[PDB]
Ligand binder design. Structure first.
Ligand SMILES: Nc1ncnc2c1ncn2[C@@H]1O[C@H](COP(=O)(O)O)[C@@H](O)[C@H]1O
Ligand SMILES: Nc1ncnc2c1ncn2[C@@H]1O[C@H](COP(=O)(O)O)[C@@H](O)[C@H]1O
Ligand SMILES: [Mg+2]
Ligand SMILES: [Mg+2]
Lengths: 595, 594
């Protein structure tokens, strides 16, 4: 049955494995965020047994872990056991959360919805366990950008409830989840110019842009659909839409717009897209050189509804143009090879009645918008391949690091390999901060690596307009881009590197490379220190600022990521409050300290 | 197919949908005293009124006839909208934004309520594309399900009444009653450690499910379980709304599917039609077989339409108790009253979600089903069935369906009304006065048995979850004592005044008067005669008749729309219905001085 087929990945054996992996990560990351304080229990062999108890005291979780730099808890999956009233019990993620509800600060309101997000994340793991199990070495050897993108399993390495996609029924999961590599056809709407606005970056004009993307034949067909209803194509702008968004939302929530002819259904476009790790961003699988399309998707994932703001679209291209120009202008960013793939164009729809009915923060203002982003594909030479930076912290079904496999392929020492990666990825971030007070959101999903023979040649940053900030409230910026100017205490500025790079990315990378015996934490962090010191030696003009915002400070604040989602799982940061949802809980030892 | 699904959404149908809904909004919100129209005298022969927005800048203008029970027959074709001196299109979303403060819609509720408005309008657009049958063709047809799927209005008080929120447009087309789309149920095997089946008198499980599905189907179901390593003895069968399977059970209850607490058995062979309640299915393949009522986590008219696993245990016993009571009472026998029983019920208890929520949680209403016997086997040659909701049906010409039953009968409007009141309304007087027992007897909970256009007898449904005994000291069989309630004495007769008079007869007497069929005076005269004739026939309750006075000058105006507007997600709250009631002054009882 297509009934039975749709749940064939939900079996006791895979459910067990899924629960073991998720509970392993719960113990590790909730210990990192100091929600749990595991108690040391009597010397087993040497490298350490621990116990975590329920709110109750009645249910015990025992495991082994190696504790690594940045208060990182490498909890052994195979070691986790559960005990109550003298007896062992099966590992069960739902029971974990009910049992540690108060320990974890889960409100009565959030718990039941959080458990849906857990339930959904576990299903996805079960789905991923049914797929062909490719080693880290096979995936590296493939050189296949979309094989890597869709082969990723973890998601965000910190958030536990990270792959919820709540709003997807099972059939929609199987059609739309990145890990399915299901081909998707975008739904195209005509949107009346009384309510839709198209914004073009330098070098973009609308009529040639849409003809390049859809082909002149499809544009002609769409013009015919409007003439057919007695409508003038000049009156309308083209908006591509996530099929989920069209069938579940715009046809109901925006029925008035469809009925009135403010919105007209044109059809599917021909090209087959693959959802990326972000879910609502599509890569063009038929024409890899064409643009990604970022769609409005009113689905809950990882602390936010994944809509797209019609208001932010107006400035989105200008912000990208400014960033690209700043990068071509800077000698250090040139040495580095840094580029972005620009958000090149954007369209937004202003639902006039919903604006009248909602504050400017409502998800109802984020139901209909899209932007186009350049493919990195046309920029690579022969011999080059592309990969999500997320791949560096990927471990295959045998625990083998994809970073490890790139090191193997490269023929370089681990530390030589790391120098090339850090020069490409990390040095731009240090220089953007010190020279321009510029920060990004540089996790695994927002960076693409260009690889030659297993070596990182250069990094490509994406997700620009909605993520970048300038940490100077009086920054002189072109009018259209000054909304990126933020006021942030001095106190918290360098947390952009310590939190987003060190605690939420390097911590996982150094640990996977240590556990697999490829390179010691000592040599990992020496290498970061050295590249850091060499960057600073090459720009003496910024000496004063290197001392003021010290990368080698003894300590910096623990910023907790799960704590945000546990306090509020629908908007885990108020996008309307002065960066002040951060949950800082004491300090971490800086691995760079004394270098 | 993309264009096919939105083909009902056109400017002309959307315009007509908005006109109808703003007409009803002006009407019912005026009835509930949220609006106070001003009289702009055209003559002094009455006629013409204005309502302003919260800011006073936008003016709504119409004509109405005010009838008994403060019923505002707002003429749909008269409604105009004006701002800064210019005419504007009637747009329902704009109506609600403009009167947000007047209507008491919170910042939190407004945007979700507007979705329910948008969805209600969409439905109207879709009903406007169906073959426009007249009340006379529908009444002549004798087709139970042509009538059921032929209704357009929905609840005649509630404006945001047909939202079905959580249906995507594809789901609207497959699942909404007005589509008459055949549905196949999805069958799950539910492990006995979490599922419990309960049977009324005369039901045993194994013969029951073979009767419903056939021996071959049950055998195949046993085959899917043995194929998987599982013993069929360990499992019960639960039928599920495919929406609930595809969107909720396969995701929210993923742990149950994966562990084999729930096993997917496939679709059932028989075709069902969604009834007006949306999650109750009539068996179109075998009309004589059971209705299936399903758990459906969608928002409609002030509630989620899930089904409580906890209430299923007592459902059949409450049904058996009411049937036996009806069978034993001479006044209820003379009336011809019967119920269609909720005969069987299964409930799933999700133990982890129990640990995580309080007993009121919708997480506990996600997997449960009951079976309700069909009325079809009980009818004789010459008899047809119709939802009581049809009496207040008006076709595309404004012609009352009740009117068309009167014409077919050859009876005077008044003779016709006696038969209807005897079958439907007397049993409600006798239940209150003799047993302190009330139902929820709106159009969707009553089926009429029809001979030659006449109401011969009435059949009640929605039983276990609706009925009350208004007496906390009632001695009732152990299983059925949860229907015992403490209601203040001064609110008891609101069961008749609110649910029958203000929420049904108000509409029926106005439709009949406006079409010129029979006057309000003669309508309410007949009601008063049948009330008096009931009371005369049972003199031992003379003292309860003076204590609960059906002919009192006045009773409280109980506002239905005010509840949905205060809370569109659970409009009646915790375990205290007598709690959320919004009483705003009084209505002139049309039985006053009779
Ligand atoms: N490895 C990953 N790192 C970060 N985000 C990820 C990753 N894999 C998937 N995601 C998802 O991508 C989205 C990130 O959005 P943004 O933070 O704007 O880049 C969220 O929905 C994340 O759950
Ligand atoms: N004419 C009608 N009268 C009452 N309820 C109706 C009508 N048409 C549809 N319904 C729906 O039927 C359901 C009534 O549920 P209940 O009150 O428990 O029988 C609601 O979801 C109503 O919106
Ligand atoms: Mg992103
Ligand atoms: Mg009902």
């Amino acid at each position: 049955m297509s009934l039975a087929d749709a749940v064939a990945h939900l079996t006791p054996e895979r459910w067990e494995e899924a629960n073991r992996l998720l509970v392993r990560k719960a113990l590790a990351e909730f210990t990192h965020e100091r929600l749990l304080t595991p108690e040391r229990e009597p010397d087993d062999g040497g490298g350490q047994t621990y116990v975590v108890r329920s709110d109750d005291g009645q249910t015990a979780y025992r495991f082994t872990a190696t504790v690594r730099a940045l208060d990182h808890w490498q909890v052994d999956a195979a070691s986790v056991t559960r005990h109550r009233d003298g007896a062992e019990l099966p590992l069960a993620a739902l029971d974990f959360f009910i049992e540690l509800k108060q320990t974890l600060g889960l409100s009565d309101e959030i718990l039941p919805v959080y458990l849906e997000e857990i339930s959904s994340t576990l299903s996805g793991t079960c789905y991923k366990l049914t797929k062909p199990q490719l080693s880290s070495a096979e995936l590296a050897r493939s050189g296949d950008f979309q094989a890597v993108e869709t082969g990723m399993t973890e998601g965000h390495p910190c958030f536990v409830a990270n792959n919820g996609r709540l709003g997807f029924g099972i059939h929609e999961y199987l059609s739309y989840a990145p890990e399915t590599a299901s081909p998707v056809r975008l739904v195209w709407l005509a949107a009346h110019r009384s309510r839709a606005a198209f914004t073009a970056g330098v070098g973009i004009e609308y009529e040639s842009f849409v003809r390049d993307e859809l082909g002149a034949a499809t544009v002609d067909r769409f013009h015919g659909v409007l003439r057919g209803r007695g409508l003038d194509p000049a009156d309308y702008l083209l908006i591509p839409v996530h099929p989920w968004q069209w069938w579940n939302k715009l046809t109901v929530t925006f029925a008035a717009e469809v009925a009135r002819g403010h919105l007209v259904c044109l059809g599917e476009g021909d090209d087959e897209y693959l959802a990326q790790q972000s879910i609502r961003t599509f890569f063009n699988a038929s024409h890899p050189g064409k643009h990604y399309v970022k769609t409005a998707l009113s689905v809950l994932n990882m602390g936010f509804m994944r809509g797209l703001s019609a208001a932010y679209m107006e400035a989105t291209p200008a912000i990208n143009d400014w960033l690209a120009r700043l990068i071509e202008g800077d000698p250090v960013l040139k040495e580095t090879g840094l580029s972005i793939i620009r958000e090149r164009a954007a369209v937004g729809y202003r639902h006039l009645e919903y604006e009248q009915a909602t504050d400017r923060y409502s998800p109802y203002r984020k139901m209909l918008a899209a932007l186009w982003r350049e493919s990195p594909v046309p920029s690579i030479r022969e011999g080059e391949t592309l990969a999500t930076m997320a791949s560096l912290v990927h471990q295959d079904h045998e625990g083998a690091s994809f970073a490890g496999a790139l090191i193997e392929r490269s023929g370089l020492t681990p530390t030589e390999w790391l120098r090339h990666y850090l020069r490409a990825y990390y040095v731009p971030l240090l220089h953007s901060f010190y020279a321009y007070d510029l920060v990004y959101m540089p996790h695994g999903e927002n960076v693409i690596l260009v690889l030659a023979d297993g070596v990182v040649r250069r990094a490509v940053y994406k997700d620009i307009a909605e993520e970048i900030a300038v940490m100077d409230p009086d920054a002189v910026l072109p009018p259209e881009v000054s909304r990126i100017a933020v006021d942030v205490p001095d106190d918290k500025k360098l947390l952009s590197i310590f939190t987003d790079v060190f605690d939420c990315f390097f911590r996982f990378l150094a640990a996977n490379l240590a556990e697999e015996g490829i390179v010691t934490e000592d040599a990992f962090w020496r290498t970061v220190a050295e590249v850091t010191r060499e960057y600073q030696e090459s720009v003496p003009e910024l000496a004063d600022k290197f001392e003021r915002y010290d990368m080698f400070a003894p300590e910096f604040a623990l910023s907790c990521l799960n704590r945000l989602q546990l306090r509020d799982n629908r908007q885990m940061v108020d996008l309307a409050d002065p960066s002040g949802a951060l949950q800082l809980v004491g300090t971490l030892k800086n691995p760079l300290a004394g270098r």
